[PDB]
């Protein structure tokens, strides 16, 4: 079943919604982002030290 939803990109807050069709009973659907990660594509150019 096609369903489109958007939620704020914050961790620690559980998002509650229901996927509901007129025919069937509405279905609870719960999403809670425990952790959100942002990985840059790094490139090691050179190494420096004393």
């Amino acid at each position: 079943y096609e369903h489109a939803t958007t939620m704020p990109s914050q961790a620690g807050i559980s998002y509650n919604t229901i996927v509901n069709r007129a025919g069937y009973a509405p279905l609870p659907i719960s999403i809670t982002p425990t952790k959100i990660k942002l990985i840059p594509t790094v490139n090691l150019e050179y190494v420096t030290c004393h």
Binding site: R21, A22, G23, Y24
Partner: protein, 98 residues
Amino acid sequence: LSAAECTLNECVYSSDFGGIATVKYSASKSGKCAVHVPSGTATLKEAAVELTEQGSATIHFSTANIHPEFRLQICTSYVTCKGDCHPPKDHIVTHPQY
């Protein structure tokens, strides 16, 4: 049957009996009552239904009208029952159109 009331709880018109209607009755005696719809708007899946003394009975029907208002015929008298149905969920059913 006396003091008969029909209440269409929830209906979904489709090929099959996607509509379910609940009828509240006050039967004079315990037993079965033959049930039919004189109009062609919907067809009852059950020819007859057992009635308690003053309980309520449920029927399953198939229709194609979004706002069906049909006067179904019971063992003794008529009752008009109107409601709003809903479109079917699945696009294609492997059943011939009732």
